[PDB]
Design a protein around this ligand. Structure first.
Ligand SMILES: *[C@@H]1O[C@H](CO)[C@@H](O)[C@H](O)[C@H]1NC(C)=O
Ligand SMILES: *[C@@H]1O[C@H](CO)[C@@H](O)[C@H](O)[C@H]1NC(C)=O
Ligand SMILES: *[C@@H]1O[C@H](CO)[C@@H](O)[C@H](O)[C@H]1NC(C)=O
Ligand SMILES: [Zn+2]
Lengths: 195, 595
């Protein structure tokens, strides 16, 4: 009963930012989702396109694990067919989705006094992101007809802001670690099915 | 690509950056008020320095855009608010002089010292001179103490005030305002929607008009206090003359709350108080705040955040840390709300627990709005909202539901009248004074009153409007308005007049929705979810909409009216008329004390 370390991502010491989200490929494994259900950490569990129970009875060839950290009020933007700062500019989910979204508060570990300036996101971008696209490029945004020749200043802003996390922020501005699972079916002999 | 679209991206940079600096500045200022230490003071100056420098850079940069090209009304207001800078438009060498006076004026007021005739001590304003004006029943003692303040501060403050008026008038000239007085009324101006627009000039001829209906209440209240003062002072008050200024109860007469002991209607009947029974059942500091939450829960307002109940100052520290004990309601931002108050087991602290918490519920309501619109509709909405919550808690009906007093207490009109006169002295006493003070300063900035006729015109208004007179003659060398905190500093005093009117407009409207039939006396808003939702549509508005729209959203009118205030005091009006019919109701401006 070989079982891939879901605890590798769900217990990672350091997560990734929103503008640079991590992607993991899972295959040739057994999917035991009881640990996630019996986990005392998770509090939000929304599944789109697939029922929550009987998850292991129907199985696919490839499973994708994804991770980032966002604000509390900003979790609800991770949903199919939604518009917002994250969906339009940082992480756009497909309109047709087959997977579950996991998010749990992590204020104790991810927030320190004086701010946690290790988390960033993108605020200005010319055109919205196609589903499942990652943009790491950092070029000075232009908001005026006259170019500024690649130096920030008047009418040219840096494309990435910074998240400032502090222990005393509100329940909406506290860090939430989000993991989304993307099940996909292809022409393979159902390598990962479960117990 | 156009000017309108590129302006939209400017605010996003400003909003996503200003909140981070605002939290740092607010948190630093919180620590000093919570821990008075030399190291903490340095942090606030550094933190405020970054906030000040950041604000000027964006405000100067915002002036580049053209206002007319902006089409979105919400965008237009947000850009315009940042565009207004003020004194920065003047030259630095003018600016340094103007700031030099303002700090100087505070120094003389802070360094208050009046030489006592005895050499034992030289009494300062805080707190010895205040004690004389409150707990002394000697006419001669009050006279020297009251004159001493004008004798010391007025003489030094007079030469400085002459340059103060001229310098500020130049600033308003560069901003296209008529005068510095026009700026102070600029916060009440909305110009766009023809149905909802206001005028800066319309603030005048409106404060006066609503004062007309107040006068019947004031004049009737004016004479009643005279009669009771006759018993203590037989040969110093004329039967139809004006009361001496020093005898009002305070140094400036801004409140009459200290006249309750002298002019109580019924001495035998005790006043309502639950302090003696609050000690029973051993109530603690956290129970008062926890109980006062149920008032807002029953009205269907949101609960309190988990960060409120911890990390908040709900009692005096036992570690000896020096603090400022004046209660305050802080909104640090980014989702953090705290209350800092000196909680004791008294009746007053129970009432202020509802008032301070009332400010917090307003702060939560407009949290969704951008940073630049996180404020009350005008300068008078914020304090008015919290005051109406204090009114309900004072009513015995709310107190009876708690079992604090006897479950079958007997109501009598004698004690209810006893309760109204105390409230009438505070709420109604300041109304003639607040209007008079702002009326004078408005005309000084215009220039109608010459600098040589400042003092002669000052007491002429007081005799005609307020109804008081100076005990001793004064000439142009004196400067009496500077003996006030709000006048010595660059503070506007009109907020304390419109707040009272708005306070009773909200209370009357929420009572009707509560299906309360009878007197406005004991109208309780508790256990009435219908009234709560009426309130939340106005609180959540913030500064997004003009105050006329916000006002209409709760009372259905587009202007300030004094009718609800008169309806509140109507039960006292009928009883007070009978008692004042025996003597003359009014005053004689011709009569003078020194002659
Ligand atoms: C993963 O984290 C959970 C949460 O505390 C913990 O119970 C579990 O032991 C962790 N797994 C490992 C392999 O340490
Ligand atoms: C409350 O008052 C009653 C009546 O005298 C008496 O038991 C005592 O004074 C108080 N009780 C407590 C527990 O403090
Ligand atoms: C009102 O008070 C007077 C005395 O002040 C008393 O004679 C009368 O009965 C009272 N009426 C009511 C309704 O309380
Ligand atoms: Zn208040």
């Amino acid at each position: 009963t070989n079982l891939c370390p879901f605890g590798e991502v769900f217990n990672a010491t350091r997560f990734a930012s929103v503008y640079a989200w991590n992607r993991k490929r899972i295959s040739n494994c057994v999917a035991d989702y009881s640990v996630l259900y019996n986990s005392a950490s998770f509090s939000t569990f929304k599944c789109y396109g697939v029922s929550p129970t009987k998850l292991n009875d129907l199985c696919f060839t490839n499973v994708y694990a994804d991770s980032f950290v966002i604000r509390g009020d900003e979790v609800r933007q991770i949903a199919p067919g939604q518009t917002g700062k994250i969906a339009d500019y940082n992480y756009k989910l497909p309109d047709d989705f087959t997977g579950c979204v996991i998010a749990w508060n992590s204020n104790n570990l991810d927030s320190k006094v004086g701010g946690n300036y290790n988390y960033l996101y993108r605020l200005f971008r010319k055109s919205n992101l196609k589903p499942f696209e990652r943009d790491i490029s950092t070029e000075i945004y232009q908001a005026g007809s006259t170019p500024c020749n690649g130096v920030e200043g008047f009418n040219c802003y840096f494309p990435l802001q910074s998240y400032g996390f502090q222990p005393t922020n509100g329940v909406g501005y506290q860090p939430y670690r989000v993991v989304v699972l993307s099940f996909e079916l292809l022409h393979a002999p159902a390598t990962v099915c479960g117990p | 690509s156009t000017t309108e679209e590129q302006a939209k991206t400017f605010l996003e940079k400003f909003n996503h950056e200003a909140e981070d600096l605002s939290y740092q500045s607010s948190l630093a200022s919180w620590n000093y008020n919570t821990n008075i230490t030399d190291e903490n003071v340095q942090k606030m100056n550094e933190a405020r320095a970054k906030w000040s420098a950041f604000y000027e850079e964006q405000s100067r940069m915002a002036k580049t855009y053209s206002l007319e090209e902006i089409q979105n009304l919400t965008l237009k207001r947000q850009l315009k608010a940042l565009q207004q800078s003020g004194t920065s438009v003047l030259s630095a060498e003018k600016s340094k002089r103007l700031n030099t006076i303002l700090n100087t004026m505070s120094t003389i007021y802070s360094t208050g010292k009046v030489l006592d005739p005895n050499t034992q001590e030289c009494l300062a304003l805080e707190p010895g001179l205040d004690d004389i004006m409150e707990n002394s029943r000697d006419y001669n003692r009050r006279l020297w103490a009251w004159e001493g303040w004008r004798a010391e501060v007025g003489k030094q403050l007079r030469p400085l005030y002459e340059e103060y008026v001229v310098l500020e008038n130049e600033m308003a000239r560069a901003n296209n305002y008529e005068d510095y007085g026009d700026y102070w009324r600029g916060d009440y101006e909305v110009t766009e929607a023809g149905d909802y627009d206001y005028s800066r000039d319309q603030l005048m001829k409106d404060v006066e008009n609503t004062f007309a209906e107040i006068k019947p209440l004031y004049e009737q209240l004016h004479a009643y206090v005279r009669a009771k003062l006759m018993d203590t002072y037989p040969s110093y008050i004329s039967p139809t003359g004006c009361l001496p200024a020093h005898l009002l109860g305070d140094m400036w007469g801004r409140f009459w709350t200290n006249l309750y002991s002298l002019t109580v209607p019924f001495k035998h009947k005790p006043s309502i108080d639950v302090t003696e029974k609050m000690k029973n059942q051993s109530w603690d500091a956290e129970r008062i705040f926890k109980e006062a939450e149920k008032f807002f829960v029953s009205i269907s307002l949101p609960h309190m955040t988990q960060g409120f109940w911890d990390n908040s100052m709900l009692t005096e520290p036992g570690d000896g840390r020096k603090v400022v004990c004046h209660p305050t309601a802080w909104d640090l931002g980014k989702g953090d709300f705290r209350i800092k108050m000196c909680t004791k087991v008294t009746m007053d602290d129970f009432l202020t627990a509802h008032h301070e918490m009332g400010h917090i519920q307003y702060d939560m309501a407009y949290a969704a709005q951008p940073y630049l619109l996180r404020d009350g509709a005008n300068e008078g909405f914020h304090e008015a909202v919290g005051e109406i919550m204090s009114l309900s808690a004072a009513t015995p009906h709310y107190l009876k539901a708690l079992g604090l007093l006897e479950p079958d207490f007997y109501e009598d009109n004698e004690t209810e009248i006893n309760f109204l006169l105390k409230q009438a002295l505070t709420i109604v006493g300041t109304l003639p004074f607040t209007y008079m003070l702002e009326k004078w300063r408005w005309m000084v900035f215009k220039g109608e009153i010459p600098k040589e006729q400042w003092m002669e015109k000052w007491w002429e208004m007081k005799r005609e409007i307020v109804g008081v007179v100076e005990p001793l003659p004064h000439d142009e060398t004196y400067c009496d308005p500077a003996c006030l905190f709000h006048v010595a500093e660059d503070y506007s005093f009109i907020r304390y007049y419109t707040r009272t009117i708005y306070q009773f407009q909200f209370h009357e409207a929420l009572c009707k929705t509560a299906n309360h039939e009878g007197a406005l006396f004991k109208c309780d808003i508790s256990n009435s979810t219908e009234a709560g939702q009426r309130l939340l549509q106005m609180l959540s508005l913030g500064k997004s909409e003009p105050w006329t729209l916000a006002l209409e959203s709760i009372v259905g009118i587009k202007t300030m009216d004094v009718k609800p205030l008169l309806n509140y005091f109507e039960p006292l009006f009928t009883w007070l008329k009978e008692q004042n019919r025996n003597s003359f109701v009014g005053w004689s401006t011709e009569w003078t004390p020194y002659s």
